[PDB]
Every structure is written in structure tokens, then in C-alpha cells.
Design a protein around this ligand. Structure first.
Ligand SMILES: C/N=c1/[nH]c2ccc(S(=O)(=O)N(CC(C)C)C[C@@H](O)[C@H](Cc3ccccc3)NC(=O)O[C@H]3CO[C@H]4OC[C@H](OCC(=O)NC)[C@H]43)cc2o1
Ligand SMILES: [Cl-]
Ligand SMILES: [Cl-]
Ligand SMILES: [Cl-]
Lengths: 99, 99
């Protein structure tokens, strides 16, 4: 698709068999979702934004569908204000910026 | 242009007679720049991201040039850790996401 930016670029994702809404976010290196359950072991990560840092749980090699496009990669879980799909997965689904 | 997302999408902007580097950020509603002087009226605002809120000064109707593209819009100025170009200006240069 081609997605304009007059509204937030919110898309439906599927992870762990559940649908969620998430923001396609070229300003995010990584993908960070609100608290949820994922399988396996996790590692610690600190990620910084406008208001400072939060601590998240890092899960690797997680299947996730983004607008129906299949990806498998790193998902961070923690107290983010909104679900954000960052460049780690935007590159998997072949997303670019164009103008 | 078509901008890859393998790396952070950084551009040069011209604003208030200054050249600055900033991130093309589809997850940002608003353009937010580090401390700088701008002419005209402003009002205080709180904006929130990962890690919570910062106080900024909101300037309206500010001319800005991004990749040779002229646009005008609102610029928030305050203690952001990095300069971001938000949707309010990305629309004006015809920037879309594509995959
Ligand atoms: C190392 N790896 C990682 N991975 C990783 C992943 C993400 C982040 S990130 O999130 O810090 N961030 C980095 C950029 C911003 C430098 C991404 C950026 O696009 C955020 C995303 C976001 C959108 C909405 C809320 C919070 C954050 N946008 C944002 O700040 O927007 C602000 C300015 O404009 C408004 O619009 C929205 C928000 O108000 C709405 C609200 O609800 N506020 C509370 C306001 C850092 C990361 O580092
Ligand atoms: Cl990844
Ligand atoms: Cl504006
Ligand atoms: Cl348009």
C-alpha cells in the first residue's frame, strides 16, 4: 500500500495469534509493544525516547504479521505509550519513505 | 526520492536561517527540535513519548525547507534528545510510506 501521513499510520498487526493496532514508525530503530505475553527467554534492553528511557523485555525471532506482511524478528515489550513498529521490521516488509 | 530504512532516515533541514540534521519520523505527530531561537508568538505545550513528557515552546506558521521542498507549519522547541520531523510537515512535502 501507499500510506499518507495526514492521520497516524496505524495498522493492524498479528502476534501470538492476536490482532493489535500499531504505529508504523520510521523514527523508531526497534519495535516496542505494550505489555503482553511472549514465549521463550528474554534479555534486558533500555530504550530512550522523548521523555527519557524505559526498560523493556527483548524477545528474538518472534513471528509477527504487519498489514498482512509476514516478518520474524525482535520484539520489545514494555511500558510504551503506544505500540510502535520500528525499522527492524519495516525493513522486513520492504517499507520505504517516498516523496 | 525513495528513502531506504536500513539506516535512520536523516535529512538536512533549513530553518530560522540555520541548517540542522533531523529524523523523518512517521511516529511523531509534531516536529520537535532541540533548543533554538525562532521569531513570532509561541505558547507552552507538553508532549509525550517513550519515557514520558517534556515541556516545549510551540511556534506556528514557521517556514522550513526539507530536501529542497518548502513547507510551513508548527515547530515545537525544547529538550528533545534528537530533532524529529513529524507528520505535520511530512504531509506538506508529499511524503508517504510504501510497501
Ligand atoms: C534503540 N531502539 C529503539 N527502538 C525504539 C522504538 C521507539 C522509540 S520512541 O517511541 O522513543 N521514538 C523515537 C523518536 C521519537 C526519537 C519513536 C517516535 O516515533 C515516537 C513514538 C511514539 C509515539 C507515541 C507515543 C510514544 C512514542 N514518537 C513521539 O515521540 O512522538 C511525540 C512527538 O510527536 C507526538 O506524536 C506522538 C507523541 O504523542 C503521542 C503520545 O501518546 N505521547 C505520549 C508525540 C525509541 C526506540 O529506540
Ligand atoms: Cl529484528
Ligand atoms: Cl502544522
Ligand atoms: Cl496527499
Amino acid at each position: 500500500p501507499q500510506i499518507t501521513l495526514w492521520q497516524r499510520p496505524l495498522v493492524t498487526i498479528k502476534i501470538g495469534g492476536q490482532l493489535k493496532e500499531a504505529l508504523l514508525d520510521t523514527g523508531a530503530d526497534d519495535t516496542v509493544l505494550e505489555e503482553m505475553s511472549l514465549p521463550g527467554r528474554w534479555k534486558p534492553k533500555m530504550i530512550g525516547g522523548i521523555g527519557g528511557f524505559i526498560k523493556v523485555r527483548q524477545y528474538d525471532q518472534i513471528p509477527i504479521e504487519i498489514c498482512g506482511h509476514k516478518a520474524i524478528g525482535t520484539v520489545l515489550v514494555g511500558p510504551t505509550p503506544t505500540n510502535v513498529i520500528g525499522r527492524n521490521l519495516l525493513t522486513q516488509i520492504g517499507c520505504t519513505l517516498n516523496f
